Every structure is written in C-alpha cells, then in structure tokens.
Design an enzyme around this catalytic site. Structure first.
Site, PDB file in Angstrom:
ATOM      1  N   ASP A   1       7.277  10.817  -1.897  1.00 19.14           N
ATOM      2  CA  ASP A   1       7.928   9.525  -1.660  1.00 19.14           C
ATOM      3  C   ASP A   1       8.590   8.923  -2.889  1.00 19.14           C
ATOM      4  O   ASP A   1       8.726   7.719  -2.953  1.00 19.14           O
ATOM      5  CB  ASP A   1       6.925   8.500  -1.108  1.00 19.14           C
ATOM      6  CG  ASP A   1       6.458   8.828   0.300  1.00 19.14           C
ATOM      7  OD1 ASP A   1       5.463   8.212   0.734  1.00 19.14           O
ATOM      8  OD2 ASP A   1       7.080   9.692   0.974  1.00 19.14           O
TER       9      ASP A   1
ATOM     10  N   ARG B   1      -2.625   8.266  -3.369  1.00 16.12           N
ATOM     11  CA  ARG B   1      -2.234   8.400  -1.968  1.00 16.12           C
ATOM     12  C   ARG B   1      -0.811   8.996  -1.830  1.00 16.12           C
ATOM     13  O   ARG B   1      -0.448   9.514  -0.789  1.00 16.12           O
ATOM     14  CB  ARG B   1      -2.336   7.031  -1.279  1.00 16.12           C
ATOM     15  CG  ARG B   1      -2.115   7.021   0.221  1.00 16.12           C
ATOM     16  CD  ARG B   1      -0.697   6.513   0.547  1.00 16.12           C
ATOM     17  NE  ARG B   1      -0.569   6.011   1.915  1.00 16.12           N
ATOM     18  CZ  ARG B   1       0.428   5.239   2.330  1.00 16.12           C
ATOM     19  NH1 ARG B   1       1.392   4.882   1.481  1.00 16.12           N
ATOM     20  NH2 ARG B   1       0.460   4.828   3.592  1.00 16.12           N
ATOM     21  N   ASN B   2      -0.017   8.889  -2.890  1.00 19.53           N
ATOM     22  CA  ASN B   2       1.327   9.437  -2.918  1.00 19.53           C
ATOM     23  C   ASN B   2       1.426  10.682  -3.782  1.00 19.53           C
ATOM     24  O   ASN B   2       2.514  11.087  -4.178  1.00 19.53           O
ATOM     25  CB  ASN B   2       2.330   8.376  -3.400  1.00 19.53           C
ATOM     26  CG  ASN B   2       2.641   7.361  -2.325  1.00 19.53           C
ATOM     27  OD1 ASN B   2       2.708   7.710  -1.150  1.00 19.53           O
ATOM     28  ND2 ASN B   2       2.776   6.094  -2.708  1.00 19.53           N
TER      29      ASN B   2
ATOM     30  N   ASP C   1       5.901   3.202  -6.566  1.00 19.39           N
ATOM     31  CA  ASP C   1       4.600   3.155  -5.889  1.00 19.39           C
ATOM     32  C   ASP C   1       3.765   4.415  -6.173  1.00 19.39           C
ATOM     33  O   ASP C   1       3.195   5.027  -5.267  1.00 19.39           O
ATOM     34  CB  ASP C   1       4.775   2.957  -4.377  1.00 19.39           C
ATOM     35  CG  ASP C   1       3.457   2.596  -3.672  1.00 19.39           C
ATOM     36  OD1 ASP C   1       3.398   2.733  -2.443  1.00 19.39           O
ATOM     37  OD2 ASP C   1       2.484   2.162  -4.342  1.00 19.39           O
TER      38      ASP C   1
END
Length: 305
Positions: free
Chosen positions: A182, A168-169, A164
C-alpha cells in the site's frame, strides 16, 4: 466500466482468461483483493502457473475509486521494482472490470505473522493463534527490520512517501521475505478523522509523526517516525502501540515528549534507534539510508542461537 477510457499498457496487460480466480484475501470499502493463479504471466514461460493477488473495485465503487486504483497502478509502474515491496505484475483493463495484479504474500501481514510466533515466556503477551508457528530467532527479527528499512530506503529514493507504514502494511511471502504494501495509495483530498478505525479496527493515528498528526505534514521523516513504531511492533512480536492510551490523550502525550517504553525483549541499541526515529524535530531523525546501514551491522552482530 465501458463508460471510461482505461489506460491499456501492452507491457503489463494480461488477458482476463489467464487468471483463475480463487479465495478472497481481503476487503476494504472499495474494494477487494482475491488470490488467483495466473497462466503464463512470464511470456517466455507460457505454461507456468503463478499465484498472484488480484485487486479490484467493489460493486459500489465510484468514479473516484476507479481513479484511485488506476493511480496506484501507475504509481507502482513509475516507482519500479524492489525485493522488499509488493510489486506490480500485470493488469486487466480491456473486456471487464479493472484488475491490478500484484505479488502475493502467502504468510499474511507482519503483525499477525509475529503474533502467531510468540513463545510462552514473560517477555511477550499471549499467542492468539490457533495454529502457532516456530518462534523466530533474534537475528530473524532484526533481519525483518533490515528488510523493511531496505524497502523504505528504495521507496524514499523514488520520492515515495508512504504515510501509513505499520506492521499491518508489511506482508510476508512464502519465503519469509518482507514486502511493504500500500505504498502507492492515493492521498485523500478531504481532511482526516483521527478516530476512524480501519477495516480491522486499527487506529492509524498511533503511527503518525506529531507534525503529520497536528499539521498533516507528511515527509520521508514522518515515515521514519512510523518505522520507529514498526520497530516497536516487531520486538513486541506484534504488540499494539501505546497500550491503554486513548487518542484524544495521545495528542497531549506526544507533545510533552512522551514516548513508548522499551519492549521487554529489546536491546538498548535497538531501543535508541526507536527513540531516534521518534525525535521531535523531523530534521533530527535518522534517514532510511542510515537505518539500513545501522540495521545491517546489527544483523551481523545479532545471534540466531
């Protein structure tokens, strides 16, 4: 929590009372991350304070949630340290709830970091921040991509598939270092809901390679596809991918060889890199090693004027 045997690891264990817990940094089902000050994190500098992110389970957390958190912690141990990932710093496992202590990125995630630095021109959507910040130079944006590619190249070499990768990560430290977050999360063992919105209402399907989307096949090459989308996010200063395209439609579009258009402020060379990452055939996408080499050259030739 005393019902469970928690893996204590003396190299990483930090007495609970060495953490001064502060403000929430985020919350997402199970569980929560809080800001903290850690006293004597480095055993050789016992009177030093370090700002850290402390991850813990929610009050409603289950046996599987605890297993997930432990699993992330152990994965980070095995993967090891790199400048461009959110590293493990320590843990509290005895005398209370599991705390996994990680590096703190004070400037938040890359999408909001870039949106707050949007200039007023024609070339970007509007700045939504109530506290706008200094615009980034052209060199800075490519350097942003370089660092993320570097982090993913390291992760790929440790046989870590992220699954993912998205702006945003990616988190930004006080010193503007990019850090992939993450990367160590456990893979859900149940099937996916392609319409589920995250705890900030993001639709993850917009970052999945077609083979990940249709067949749930994740590899380093599907991560390279995600990196392509992230590159697009970067040169839109935090734009939302496939604007106005609903999910049920995204299925069909990708199949027909549909790809996002070039952002208004993006070089042809950087747009070709995106398109290469979005090659339909996984074996034909570049690798993170190639991407790190290309982006290194491009940073050198790119102006900070």
């Amino acid at each position: 929590v005393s019902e469970y045997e928690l893996p204590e690891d003396p190299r990483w264990e930090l007495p609970r009372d060495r953490l001064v817990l502060g403000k929430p940094l985020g919350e997402g089902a199970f569980g929560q991350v809080v800001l903290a000050e850690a006293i004597g994190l480095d055993k050789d500098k016992p009177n030093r304070v370090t700002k850290v992110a402390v991850k813990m389970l929610k009050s409603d957390a289950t046996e599987k949630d605890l297993s997930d958190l432990i699993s992330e912690m152990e994965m980070m141990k095995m993967i090891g340290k790199h400048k461009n990932i959110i590293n493990l710093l320590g843990a509290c496992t005895q005398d209370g709830p599991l705390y996994v202590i990680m590096e703190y990125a004070s400037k938040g995630n890359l999408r909001e970091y870039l949106q707050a630095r949007r200039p007023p021109g024609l070339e970007y959507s509007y700045n939504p921040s109530h506290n706008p910040e200094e615009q980034l130079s052209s060199k800075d944006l490519v350097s942003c991509a370089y660092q993320v590619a570097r982090g993913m190249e390291y992760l790929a070499s440790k046989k870590c598939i992220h699954r993912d990768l998205a702006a945003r990560n990616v988190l930004v430290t006080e010193d503007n270092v990019m850090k992939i977050a993450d990367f160590g999360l456990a893979r859900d063992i149940h099937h996916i809901d392609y319409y589920k919105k995250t705890t900030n209402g993001r639709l993850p399907v917009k970052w999945m390679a077609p083979e990940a989307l249709f067949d749930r096949i994740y590899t380093h090459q599907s991560d390279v596809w995600s990196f392509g989308v992230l590159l697009w996010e970067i040169f839109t200063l935090g734009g939302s991918p496939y604007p106005g395209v609903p999910v049920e439609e995204l299925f069909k579009l990708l199949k027909e060889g549909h790809r996002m258009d070039k952002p208004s402020n993006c070089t042809n060379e950087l747009y070709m890199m995106m398109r290469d990452c979005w090659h339909a055939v996984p074996s034909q996408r570049p690798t993170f090693k190639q991407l790190v080499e290309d982006l290194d050259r491009i940073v050198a030739l790119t102006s900070n004027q």
